[PDB]
Ligand binder design. Structure first.
Ligand code: SF4
Ligand code: F3S
Length: 77
């Protein structure tokens, strides 16, 4: 699953949203978040996002594995 990181915070829009086949980009506090478990591991938003602020959950640094859990939590239970 492809997930937000730090750099989109405050940047807030650009934007990714509309490109996603399964539209699973949803707003949070400031920036958007993504449902990674709905997201089908695709490369569309990755390419469009400035400097790919959208990073894959694995690649996402441990520091920001927190945010990835957050993006989950947002649409989890
Ligand atoms: S990686 Fe694709 S499926 Fe996933 S959030 Fe991005 S555009 Fe949507
Ligand atoms: S900057 Fe943020 S709005 Fe989307 S295009 Fe990147 S995740």
């Amino acid at each position: 699953a492809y997930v937000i990181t730090e750099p989109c915070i405050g940047t807030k829009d650009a934007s990714c949203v509309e490109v996603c086949p399964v539209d699973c980009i949803h707003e949070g506090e400031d920036q958007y978040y993504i449902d990674p478990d709905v997201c089908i591991d695709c490369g569309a938003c990755e390419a469009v996002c400035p400097v790919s602020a959208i990073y894959h959950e694995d690649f996402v640094p441990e520091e920001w594995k927190s945010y990835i859990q957050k993006n989950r939590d947002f649409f989890k239970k």
